[PDB]
Amino acid sequence: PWPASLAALALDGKLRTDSNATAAASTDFGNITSALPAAVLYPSSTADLVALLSAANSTPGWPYTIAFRGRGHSLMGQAFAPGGVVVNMASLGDAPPRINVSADGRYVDAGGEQVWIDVLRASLARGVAPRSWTDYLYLTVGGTLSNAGISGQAFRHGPQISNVLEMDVITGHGEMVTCSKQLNADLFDAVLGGLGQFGVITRARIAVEPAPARARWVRLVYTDFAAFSADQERLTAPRPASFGPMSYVEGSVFVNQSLATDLANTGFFTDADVARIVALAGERNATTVYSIEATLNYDNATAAAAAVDQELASVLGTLSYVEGFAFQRDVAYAAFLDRVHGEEVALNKLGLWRVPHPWLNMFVPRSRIADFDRGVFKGILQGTDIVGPLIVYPLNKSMWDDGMSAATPSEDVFYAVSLLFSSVAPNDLARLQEQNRRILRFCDLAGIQYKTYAARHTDRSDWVRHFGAAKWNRFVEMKNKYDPKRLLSPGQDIFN
Ligand SMILES: *Cc1cc2c(cc1C)nc1c(=O)[nH]c(=O)nc-1n2C[C@H](O)[C@H](O)[C@H](O)COP(=O)(O)OP(=O)(O)OC[C@H]1O[C@@H](n2cnc3c(N)ncnc32)[C@H](O)[C@@H]1O
Numbered sequence: 126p127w128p129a130s131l132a133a134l135a136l137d138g139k140l141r142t143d144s145n146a147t148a149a150a151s152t153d154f155g156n157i158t159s160a161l162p163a164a165v166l167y168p169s170s171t172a173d174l175v176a177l178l179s180a181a182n183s184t185p186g187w188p189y190t191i192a193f194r195g196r197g198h199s200l201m202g203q204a205f206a207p208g209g210v211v212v213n214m215a216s217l218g219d220a221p222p223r224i225n226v227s228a229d230g231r232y233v234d235a236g237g238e239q240v241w242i243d244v245l246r247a248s249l250a251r252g253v254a255p256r257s258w259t260d261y262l263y264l265t266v267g268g269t270l271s272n273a274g275i276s277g278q279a280f281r282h283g284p285q286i287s288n289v290l291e292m293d294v295i296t297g298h299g300e301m302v303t304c305s306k307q308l309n310a311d312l313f314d315a316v317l318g319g320l321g322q323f324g325v326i327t328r329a330r331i332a333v334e335p336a337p338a339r340a341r342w343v344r345l346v347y348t349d350f351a352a353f354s355a356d357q358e359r360l361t362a363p364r365p366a367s368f369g370p371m372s373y374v375e376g377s378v379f380v381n382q383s384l385a386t387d388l389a390n391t392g393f394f395t396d397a398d399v400a401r402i403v404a405l406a407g408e409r410n411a412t413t414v415y416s417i418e419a420t421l422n423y424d425n426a427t428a429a430a431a432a433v434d435q436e437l438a439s440v441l442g443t444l445s446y447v448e449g450f451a452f453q454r455d456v457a458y459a460a461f462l463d464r465v466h467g468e469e470v471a472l473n474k475l476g477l478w479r480v481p482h483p484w485l486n487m488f489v490p491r492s493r494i495a496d497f498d499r500g501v502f503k504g505i506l507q508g509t510d511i512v513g514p515l516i517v518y519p520l521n522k523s524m525w526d527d528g529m530s531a532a533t534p535s536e537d538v539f540y541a542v543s544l545l546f547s548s549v550a551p552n553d554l555a556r557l558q559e560q561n562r563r564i565l566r567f568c569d570l571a572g573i574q575y576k577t578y579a580a581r582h583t584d585r586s587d588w589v590r591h592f593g594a595a596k597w598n599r600f601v602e603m604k605n606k607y608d609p610k611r612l613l614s615p616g617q618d619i620f621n
Pocket residue numbers: 154192193194195196197198199200203204214237238258259260261264265266267268269271272273274275276320321322324325326327477579614616617
């Protein structure tokens with residue numbers, strides 16, 4: 126038996142079972158696992174989501190799990206609802222306006238379904254921009270907020286979950302709830318890094334700053350991991366006040382075997398730069414090369430170019446990169462922020478949405494990052510052909526709210542480590558998946574207390590270890606309060 130509001134969605138053609146709809150919602154960016162849903166919902170307003178979830182809560186024996194597909198950027202089926210209902214969130218963006226910049230210019234309201242690129246465009250039109258980003262802008266507000274949302278700005282602003290004033294969340298009961306640190310703080314905390322377990326974000330209120338016009342964009346080259354890591358930490362350390370001048374700090378690892386090809390494929394270095402770095406590696410007999418990637422944001426002011434030149438020259442003077450290996454670009458701010466989709470349209474060397482992506486993303490405590498470098502970059506990854514960036518950069522724990530669902534290492538400094546392998550042949554995929562297990566096995570045996578990011582575990586004890594036992598208890602508490610029927614985002618494999 127169906128409720129009247131639920132059947133209306135089927136009547137309006139919003140709830141679909143055709144092979145076209147179900148197929149499109151059965152694969153994801155990872156391109157490794159697939160799972161057909163029974164149906165796909167295309168909501169025209171938030172009321173349609175209320176209707177679906179109210180029906181689910183007020184129908185005994187309801188057998189259909191529900192997932193909220195943003196853009197399906199998930200790597201291992203986290204956005205699937207096997208034999209259930211997948212919500213095509215983007216359908217919410219098809220009047221009223223889905224992105225509302227505040228009157229006072231302090232925040233931007235965006236629909237959970239909206240992709241960050243559009244949030245950026247609407248913000249820039251009104252002279253503002255969010256402060257904390259992801260590397261890739263074609264992800265959804267609600268998708269990144271269910272994880273954390275990390276990029277090179279997070280060391281100073283925290284992850285994207287640390288830059289949300291409030292949210293509208295339709296809970297697993299079918300109830301629209303507005304939440305913040307004040308009103309319904311428990312739900313607010315649960316949903317942020319919550320892996321879609323407690324409800325769907327329909328609106329997020331995102332902190333903004335005045336929009337810079339340009340980014341001075343620099344790469345610094347190292348052959349010594351100790352110098353590389355020390356300088357990253359120097360650039361990201363809190364002052365004896367706030368954080369230094371840098372707007373963004375990330376880093377890259379280049380393995381010797383494919384050094385020239387990989388440097389050239391950054392889209393940053395010229396062929397002249399590449400030849401010099403390759404020569405440097407040969408001179409130092411390096412099996413690995415490291416590059417800090419950093420920016421300084423500034424405006425159109427006439428002095429700004431000179432002020433940034435002085436600020437940068439000052440900053441660079443404290444660093445220990447190989448003398449003469451500072452490489453400098455200057456681009457529009459939006460161009461920098463959208464660099465990754467920029468490459469996707471340009472070349473798509475990584476076969477985004479085209480080939481399998483057995484990506485490994487994790488947080489590594491600072492005290493063990495040198496061991497990780499030895500065991501992985503100078504160990505496991507040596508003598509292999511790698512297609513895809515190896516990104517390494519430190520984060521400050523102080524800018525993370527451990528009350529929120531997202532799990533991080535306990536140390537004050539930890540590194541985002543993103544091994545973004547793209548698979549060609551099928552034997553490459555199995556090799557890469559094995560290599561990922563081998564990396565995690567290494568860390569386990571070495572006693573490295575890492576946390577995975579944007580990964581799903583298939584074992585209960587693994588999820589318990591992931592959150593920590595005490596934090597796990599409050600995760601289950603929130604699951605019982607907000608999704609007692611355990612229908613939401615089953616692809617995370619936490620309660621399903
Ligand atoms: C594909 C990819 C992903 C990516 C990235 C680059 C690429 C090419 N760069 C990232 C980065 O620099 N920093 C970062 O933190 N993440 C980066 N990502 C990973 C990305 O965050 C995840 O893929 C994430 O899942 C967001 O992607 P998407 O918006 O497409 O969300 P999804 O995969 O469909 O769903 C993920 C889970 O969240 C639940 N969900 C989705 N929307 C909502 C809303 N609105 N409310 C509540 N829950 C939601 C889904 O149910 C699913 O479980």
